[PDB]
Amino acid sequence: SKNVVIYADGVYDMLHLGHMKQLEQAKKLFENTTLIVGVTSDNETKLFKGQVVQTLEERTETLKHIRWVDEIISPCPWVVTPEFLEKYKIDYVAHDDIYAWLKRAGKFKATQRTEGVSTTDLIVRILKNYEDY
Amino acid sequence: SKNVVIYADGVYDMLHLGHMKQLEQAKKLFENTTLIVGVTSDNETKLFKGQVVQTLEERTETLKHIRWVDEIISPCPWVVTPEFLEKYKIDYVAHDDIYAWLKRAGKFKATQRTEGVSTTDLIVRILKNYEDY
Known part of the structure; x- marks a missing residue:
């Protein structure tokens, strides 16, 4: 294939x-894939999205340990462009309109977020060992 | 090799x-390895070592995403025995005396802990955005 x-x-x-x-879901969209992962910059994430604990270098270094990741673009562009897809020969963008041009190109693939498994969720579990009263 | x-x-x-x-360090001790990772049980960890946020199933499911891991034994035994090494055909145990019998057998390999990169360390960084006064 x-x-x-x-x-x-x-x-x-x-x-x-x-x-x-x-990441696993994106890697497994087809039988034989190359999964490229883009990691957003510190400045653009904080300006447009919200607070970030870890620097780009930390976030990227952690991602390299994940088996599904074949290539990392760090930092990646804040907005995906058609030129960027051409440059890296990307067949599909795996995302969970401004995605509209991707869907129109047939290059959009849906992935899902899992609820209740985040790092901050774990800290909330720790805190729950301490009753309010 | x-x-x-x-x-x-x-x-x-x-x-x-x-x-x-x-895990990467253990996987890379030799050029061609199989890295088996043992994940300790909830009851034995809490009884002998300390508090644990995540269940065995959660801890094991997260570990399967790590590229260096080839096999997982979950739960693993709290104490490694020579019979366990024989059963799984283990050449070396990668650990950071009660390791004495391992060193005497030539089956001990040292790995190192990294400081200041833990999950709780990240939460401490979050907290530091809130001055005491």
Whole structure:
């Protein structure tokens, strides 16, 4: 089977099982893939999205340990462009309109977020050992 | 080169970069390895070592996403025995005396812990955005 190049991006701050399952889902969209993961910059994430604990270098270094990841673009562009898809020969973007041009090109693949498995969720579990009263 | 079977074990609660680097180090002790990772049970960890946020199923499911891991024994035994090494054909145990019999057998390989990269370390960083006064 032809090798399909998949692109996913995100912040990947305090990487947790939810990120990992989403990367697995993107990697497995076709039988033979190359999964390219883009990691957003510190400045653009903080300006447009929200707070980030870990630096780009930390977030990228953690992601390299994840089996589904074949290539990392770090930092990646904040907005995906058709030129970027051409440059990296990307067949599909795996994402969970401004995705509209991707869907119109047939280059959009849906992935899902998993609830209740995040790093902060784990800290909330720790805190629950301490009754209010 | 002959394939060398490596065994590492631990709790792997809130898996973080430090665990990942230690698994990588064990996987790379020789050029061609099989890295078997043992994940300790909830009851034995809590009784003998300390508190654990995540259940065995959670800790094991997160570990399967780590590229260095070839096999997981979950739950693993709390104490490694020579019979266990024979059963799984383990050549070396990668660990950071009661290791004495392992060193005497020539089956001990040292790995290192990384400081300041744990999950709780990240939460401490979050908290530091809130001045005491």
